[PDB]
Symmetry: T
């Protein structure tokens, strides 16, 4: 069926491409958060184990909402290691850093998702894609709150 | 009691008339979805009976939130067959189509409501009615997602 | 597949037409109750806003139960403005009455549905359709209880 | 201790005999629906697996309500394969039919239960046993609704 | 407001008087069951304490339903020691019987309420008050089942 | 089996005597609250119908706690119309007052229970029955708060 | 579609034959337990009515898991009176024994299912079917625990 | 750690200052609503006791959410009597008005919060702080809905 | 309506003034705890953020219980910054202390409420106001427990 | 840091010692009840298995509340076998009594805890430890109620 | 701190390596199932969308459990795209297959995980690691069951 | 009654002897964990207070499951201080260690329970006691997981 929702095929494709970057970033942050949740040690084990669990749990829902916005726009959602490693702007950590370095990396990762989302807005303004604009806003709200919570631990 | 929320009486009346068409479209889609939920038949009965129940259940909430934004703006909310037929841009199915046709009509229904919501955004462009704009957006998200789920069934 | 439930084709169709009128009254009353819920004002707003909410929420379930008794009997359930306006015996209200008058009409509404339900029991005398007799009975109980609670507000 | 509920010993014994048949049909249908729930295959596996799950789950309460009405009437409730195969009128299926045939046998199964319920009302005409009457009524209504939903799959 | 539910004042008043007797019996049984719940002793304390608790909890809702059927019929619901002693046919117990006599007495209690219910049906023959007939049918269901459970303890 | 909880038999029997008055007062107020919940009418019906439901629901628990404290002191708990009419200091209402009068009587009912409770404290202090003293305190808290809400309606 | 789970077809068939016996035994104990739940009488009625309900409720889940392990091994699951009376090794009770004998029959029924499970392990060890061995282990845990609870009543 | 969320320290501090006024208004209205909840009298006591409870409950969540957006922007959140007194624009009531005056003062308090929020948007449009704008918007939607409900009581 | 709960006007008024100080102390501790919840930083952020949230959530309910006991005594509940600044014995904090200092201050705050409540017992014993005495006792228990938990963090 | 809850080191120490006896008694009774829960046999198995489970579950919460009152008083809470064997007045049982002897021992254990509790009120009379006195009273309430339920089984 | 759980360091390392492959396999199947959940289309959309959600939701729990068993054995859990790509034996799917081919791929995926799990048992038997063996068995039970449900759709 | 479950009397007795050591160990660890939950102080108070509560809560269920396996094997379950201090292999701590030492002892406690379980498996393998073997496997899984979480805090 034709898709008649007030955005042309070429603009939908372009929003889908930006959202694909956002998805890869969110999913990469999801796995890293899940990773640090397993692997963190030291006197903050209990608090960071729990904190990270709440974060990756929220991220899993976000991954699903971002992907399904892509589907609503008429495009398949990417979902492989290869696609996400290419599309993602988050630094992957292959070892096991100390707790404070895990915290910093996760702070940076929240800001990376925010940065990716800020890059998509001018496009959304130009085509007046209000639903996608609201989704980006919610993600920034969540990632900027999570950033305050994480960095507060470092003071 | 004087209403002082930063939108003038004339402005609020135009917005209320906009939302009144959204409401009527939403309510008309509600009943059509409820109809098809009762009357669909075929090997897709169980999944369509259920999917349509989820849709009209969500729409019952939406009509109430729309009706009550009208009231917050200071105007009665319409609620009769006569006033919805007048305001509704959706054509009702008086018979019982095949299941594929039901699905096709419900996709068109979602798109009809998205259309009505887009027509109201300029009204707000002047007056700084952020709450109504968010409501229009939330409705576009829901209907654009439901469009995807419905049409995916055709493929 | 043939229907073999101890009721013949001609009878099932007659009972279906009966319930189609009960459906139409229940739904029209549902919409009016939901209407008054939005638009009532005065010192009884909170109590009436809440009472009418409870009422239309119950009626939404009743319409579904009535529609699906129709399908059980082997006939389509009606569900459009035009079909309900034809079949309905409910006094439509297009304006916004004072609170006391909303209560009064809502009382008459309950008694209208009771009346429609009573109009159907003779079709079940010779036929012995106990399920429909129980459905009719339950609606009478609910609508007569609601009539008491509403008219008590006037006294 | 004497049983004094307004029904004579020979009347109760006779209603119990009839409910013993209803129990045996319901239980036989329960087992068969559980059978199909496990063994059905084909593209409708997910919908029928769940649909048959919902039905046998409801029938598990039914068999218990029927048995305990027999105990209320002051007689033992039957509960062995031997007693249920004697009393049952459901055609038992020893193989694994295709999905469409599983559905038809369950449509018949519902109609078989309704038929048994109807054969019991005359016993109650003479004696005024309103509880048992309402039990047959509610069983008739569940099975007739279930039969609508099952046969809607075949069109 | 005129009450217009298909039962005239004179017939409504006769039913109300019948229900007032049923309300008084149910309530006197509620208090007796509550009494025994507190005062029973001996090896069956735990099982009877609990069983009786379940019975009086269900009776507390029944009195409310009966009383409110009387209001629906348009008459006041009795609620004083004086009025219940007058209307009630339950033999009050002023001492503390042994557990087995408590049980036998609560069996008689159940049968007594059934007896009162069985007496009201003729007033309904003439008038066709289907909601009230269903109320009595339910109460007979509950007390007859309860009577099976209670007397089973004595064998 | 002997009771050895730090209170001699005759002191326990005196405490139970007071608690029997408190019980009878609580149950009488329970029934009158239940009565007014059924029978109250006028503009306040919804709010009073509800408020009295919360009150009698609470009192039904209190009745049970008072009765079981009597049991714990080793005495039977009174539970008949005759014992409660004798023990109760609450004047019953055989008619149907206006709503403002219902409120008025229920306010005084709370104070009647507080008065019975206050009379028992000197005995509790004398024999140092801390649990009963705490129970009476809780009832006074509840009844005094309830009086404030009732009488707030009259201003 | 091919089944490739580390167990050859002939070995899976032999596992399915053992589980078909386990299934029939579990379902037979299910019906018997359900029977005794209905029909038991005497001073232990309340405790045995509830204890037997817990058991048959858990057995209903068990028959579903056993059946579906058969399905996962690639064979249809037996589900008729004929198949179960043939595959089952538990003597059914056609009558209504005393409470003490019902308990005894149920202890032995637990041991009967355990005995059938134990006969299957040498096969499971030979072919290394770890999931089925765990399923049998879980059944033995439940049946041996239930045996202890039942026989504890007789002492 | 640096804060890199797309907004420079200077604009963040000014957004923080505007939110501090929003927080002080929200919290002052919270306490006043709590106050009126405790102290309102008259026939509308139940309705407003409950209504004001719902309002201050919601407002307690809102003060948390505003305070934590301030923290996410990198500034401390004010939380003292002195600070909220300096920062709030809401008239404080040192006595106990009549109910109508309580309603009117709370209608104005909604509108004052809405007005403080409208004063903040210019700053956020110039800086594309989408999360804070959504926060301001939700606050407006709630207070404007609350103002409809409250003023509706007066008519 | 007169207040008759066994305590004269003058005594009730002196109790209300004591409870007014208790309320002011509790609300002031409530806001300071909320303040610290928002603004604490350092490696204990997560544990203190959560701990302080549990504390202020509990104090919100205590605020409401203290104020409503004032009302039950027949006096209006104070609730404004002016009243609480006048009545409160708690040292307020206008900056953002280090985590260890926040803890120590919250310990002090617990002890200040205890101190205020201890100051009120002499009056309660002379007049036998048992409910208010139980209230103070519950507050002292809660605050002395919270003090153990807070001060345990310092060790 | 320092403890300023108005009791004074020497008295807190005396009260802690008494609560240490209470804790030891409560915990010894917890284990004994748990022991009888596992080991009881005979016709009362189900009822006492469940009843003893209800009791030890409640005691688990009580040992925690008693221990933490000791901590609130500024002293460590004992918790080893050696300590509890020293502080405890409860008669340890090394075998498996008959059911009736199990009940009798548990009655005696409730009374042992009551007796220990009563020995502590004098340490409090001088000192004004309202929270500890309330804890003793709640424990006495629970154990005296449990004593009634237990000994009711013997009568 | 030393790990003393009855398994030497070298064997723990080797078990951790096998579980790492299981983890990578499980997580790759997680993402693919999640991918097909977003991207599947056609008449089975609703059923497969739901079915795949159930599966990936379960797999998300399994990835956590497998990783935390690796942590209990004393070794870091892998969690990056590069590490899973290296360890995983699952075939990635970079496009959007037809629904029948999605099904067949997920069937194969279940079998691949089962195959990885079977490869680990030999090591588990040399060293008696019961918990890890039980983990492998549970995973095999889940995936073999899922395999049946999936391939049942193809038939 | 004869216990017939495939294990002879001397073997069951030897299993019960091993499970009695396990139980004693589990119970002792339960009390020590509860002890440290009360008495731990320092900046980790909040996180260990909570962590230890989770552990001791789970150990109370384990205590119950191990004891009831002993009962199901036909032997009494030990439950006294004297028997547990004799059967148990865990060092009792009679003081209040520093937090890190509490963690250390709790790690060793988990490993002590594992060690006791390891000593029992050879017997279970010899006689093929599958249920007890699964119970020990679960206990090893829980304690090895807990050992990881505790020692992760030390690092
Ligand atoms: Fe975890
Ligand atoms: Fe999804
Ligand atoms: Fe439905
Ligand atoms: Fe609404
Ligand atoms: Fe609303
Ligand atoms: Fe429906
Ligand atoms: Fe299933
Ligand atoms: Fe049952
Ligand atoms: Fe009780
Ligand atoms: Fe009611
Ligand atoms: Fe009601
Ligand atoms: Fe009770
Ligand atoms: Fe039952
Ligand atoms: Fe199943
Ligand atoms: Fe309140
Ligand atoms: Fe917060
Ligand atoms: Fe937070
Ligand atoms: Fe309140
Ligand atoms: Fe148990
Ligand atoms: Fe605790
Ligand atoms: Fe979805
Ligand atoms: Fe985890
Ligand atoms: Fe605690
Ligand atoms: Fe247990």
């Amino acid at each position: 069926m034709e898709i008649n929702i007030g955005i042309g095929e070429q603009d939908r494709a372009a929003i889908a491409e930006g959202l694909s970057r956002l998805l890869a970033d969110t999913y990469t942050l999801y796995l890293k958060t899940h990773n640090f949740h397993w692997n963190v040690t030291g006197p903050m084990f209990n608090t960071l184990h729990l904190m990270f669990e709440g974060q990756y749990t929220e991220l899993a829902v976000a991954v699903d909402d971002i992907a399904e916005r892509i589907r609503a726009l008429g495009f398949p959602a990417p979902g492989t290691y290869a696609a996400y490693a290419r599309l993602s702007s988050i630094k992957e950590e292959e070892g096991v850093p100390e707790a404070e370095e895990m915290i910093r990396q996760l702070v940076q990762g929240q800001e990376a998702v925010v940065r990716t989302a800020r890059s998509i807005f001018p496009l959304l303004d130009k085509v007046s894609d209000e639903p996608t604009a609201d989704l980006l806003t919610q993600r920034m709200q969540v990632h900027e709150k999570t950033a305050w919570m994480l960095r507060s631990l470092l003071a």
